[model samples]
Target: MDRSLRPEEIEELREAFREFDKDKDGYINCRDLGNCMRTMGYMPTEMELIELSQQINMNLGGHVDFDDFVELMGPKLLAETADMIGVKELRDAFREFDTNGDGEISTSELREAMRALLGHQVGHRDIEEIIRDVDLNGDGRVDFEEFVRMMSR
Candidate 1:
């Protein structure tokens, strides 16, 4: 799937491009493409770079400018972000249960969340049972780690 770069991702791309553009002419040669990707936090193999260069050079040049850099990397970086998007949504859900804004889900918060999810079927002991199952530190609360662990299961 195609995806665009966020502002931070674009900033990283600019930094990476400048870091590798040894000529200082604001463009990187095709030969330096692999190192450029490495500077951008990718460890692409020689074979992978070779294939990438072939695709990149189509209707393009031996040198890639800043605009070219962004166009080339937008999809690549966004694909990586897509992989971690679930974690972000998980954090948001965890925040929902952290009603007190203490960064941890207390029994009352969990009870309310369970009631919201399971409706009138939820009971007090059920909330206690869930907390006991997920609370690793026995702190009687579900921290972000505990929440993630619970959701993962």
Candidate 2:
């Protein structure tokens, strides 16, 4: 389950989002979003960043306003905090599991890594259920593309 953000953290994120939406247009396009991520020390590639922007910009105007940005990224940041994993740590974990050296991750590999991390407390059935939920292609496999898509949801 996702945890709620601290009041101070929420305000801080709102301030950051306002500052990032430079034009005061109440919206941030892909470029602005990318810049914001960079300021936060996340350097996603152009394509990846665009995907993120699009995902958060549910209104689909190619931009995200402060409210939208906060609503999307805030909970994610809080969840990461609750898990004791920062952005860098999450990235490192992803890199470790993406064993094929292919930027994408396969379901079998992810299952193995998750099992190792969770130990016997989480059974194969539990892992498979999650895999089925996130595997969009219905191919019984998940790559980085699918992973990103799943997270966007």
Q: What TM-score against the true fold does each predicted structure earn? A: 0.45, 0.38
Model 2 Cα lDDT, one tens digit per residue, 1-153: 154554655666766676676643544577777666544334456887666766755555546666776776665454333124344655665677788777656666787776555553456777688778877778776765565455442
Q: TM-score of predicted model 2? A: 0.38
Global lDDT scores for all candidate models:
0.69, 0.61
Residue 149, model 1, lDDT: 74
Off by over 4 Å in 1: 23-31, 55-59, 81-153
lDDT by residue for model 1 over 1-153, one digit each (tens)?
A: 243354666787888768655543533355577667755555566786777677655445446678876777655654442223367766877888899899999989998887665555567888889889999999898898888777452
Error of 2 at 18 (Å): 0.8
